[PDB]
């Protein structure tokens, strides 16, 4: 108990162990049953503890490496009178192990923490109540993308609809994907050199309009 | 399952509850396939009931589930819905709200009855999109985003 899993969870894993042991037991060896069963029972409980007790699941060999590293540091501290540094542990752990590896193995072992863990005596305070949401865009962000889309349209309209269309294809502001020169030229019925060239002149006219009006600089961040 | 600033993970208690459920359901399916005795399947069935109980209303019947190393019951679906902090009276009869502020009250006897004294600072943030719009109207800034940049820092404010 006290190792990640409920007593009853532990008993049902020991019961899966008992099942393997019944189906694998050879009375002919003259051994009592308990002796052989205890092995498969211990085996089953340890595989469950290593397989479920972590919210973020970590392969069996890795859990064993983490636990070895635990016990090493505990020996090191019980002889040093103090906690060990990463370097002392990378020594007592053996070759192949440098301080950096101790560090990263710990950072991997870091269990998640509850969003409902309170901060205050009152129940008014959770830990989730301080975590923003960095995925859904802010209204500032969305509005800025809207003003960008509109100003890009405003400066694209000063181009002829052919060069505006060549650029809206070669970058993908329409349909979401950018095209090759052969596709823009087999759509416009023009050579890839010619469609690349009217892309050149479209970009150059847009650069001139931008040196003049300066309406798009503020969106370059 | 959110990575907070420090890189460490926050998570919800509904995750540990569901995980308990899937583990007891999977172990049950496997003790059935392997033909396990009665007593054992009875115990797995009971424990599975109690896992579904805890997910839906933890602590309602018998013990409350907890995460290891804590005496603190886990937040079940019922505790989310019901309660002074439950969703109903926490986010649907009252919400936190944008465009608000708060400060210390002082007596203003020179105000008319329909008036209040509101500091410049609270007023510049509480009216901030308007402030960008009218900052663009007059020459103070080229566009909305340049105005927001200009108000970002205090010393830039004119």
């Amino acid at each position: 108990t006290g190792r990640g899993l409920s007593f009853l969870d532990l008993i049902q894993e020991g019961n899966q162990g008992l099942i393997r042991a019944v189906e694998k037991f050879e009375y002919k060896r003259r051994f009592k049953f308990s002796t052989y069963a205890t092995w498969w029972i211990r085996q089953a409980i340890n595989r469950a503890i290593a397989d479920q007790a972590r919210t973020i699941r970590i392969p069996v060999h890795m859990v064993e490496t983490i636990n070895k590293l635990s016990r090493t540091a505990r020996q090191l501290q019980q002889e040093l009178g103090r906690e060990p540094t990463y370097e002392e542990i990378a020594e007592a752990m053996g070759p192949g192990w440098d301080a950096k590896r101790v560090e990263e193995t710990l950072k991997i072992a870091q269990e998640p923490v509850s969003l409902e863990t309170p901060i205050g005596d009152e129940k008014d305070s959770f830990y989730g109540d301080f975590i923003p949401d960095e995925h859904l865009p802010s209204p500032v962000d969305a509005a800025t993308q809207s003003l960008l889309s509109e100003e890009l349209e405003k400066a694209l309209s000063k181009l002829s609809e052919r060069e505006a269309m060549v650029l809206k294809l070669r970058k993908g502001l329409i349909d979401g994907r950018e095209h090759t020169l052969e596709e823009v030229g087999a759509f416009f019925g023009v050579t890839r050199e010619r469609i690349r060239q009217i892309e050149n002149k479209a970009l150059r006219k847009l650069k001139y309009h931008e040196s003049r009006t300066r309406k798009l600089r503020d969106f370059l961040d | 399952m959110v990575q907070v600033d420090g890189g460490r993970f926050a998570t919800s208690d509904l995750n540990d509850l569901y995980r308990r459920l899937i583990n007891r359901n999977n172990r049950l399916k496997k003790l059935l396939a392997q033909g396990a005795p009665e007593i054992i399947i009875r115990n797995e069935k009971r424990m599975l009931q109690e896992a579904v109980d805890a997910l839906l209303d933890n602590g309602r019947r018998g013990a409350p589930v907890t995460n290891p190393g804590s005496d603190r019951p886990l937040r079940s679906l019922t505790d989310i819905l019901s309660g002074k902090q439950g969703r109903f009276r926490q986010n649907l009869l009252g919400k936190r709200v944008d465009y608000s502020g708060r400060s210390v009250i002082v007596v203003g006897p020179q105000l008319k009855l329909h008036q209040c004294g509101l500091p410049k600072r609270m007023a510049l943030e509480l009216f901030k999109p308007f402030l960008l719009k009218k900052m663009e109207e007059k020459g103070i800034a080229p566009n909305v985003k340049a105005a927001r940049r200009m108000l970002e820092r205090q010393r830039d404010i004119k």
Binding site: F7, L8, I11 | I39, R42, N43, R46, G62
Partner: peptide
Amino acid sequence: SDPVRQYLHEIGQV
């Protein structure tokens, strides 16, 4: 009422 006491009883049957 206490699942592990109940299961200890069912086990002490056999």
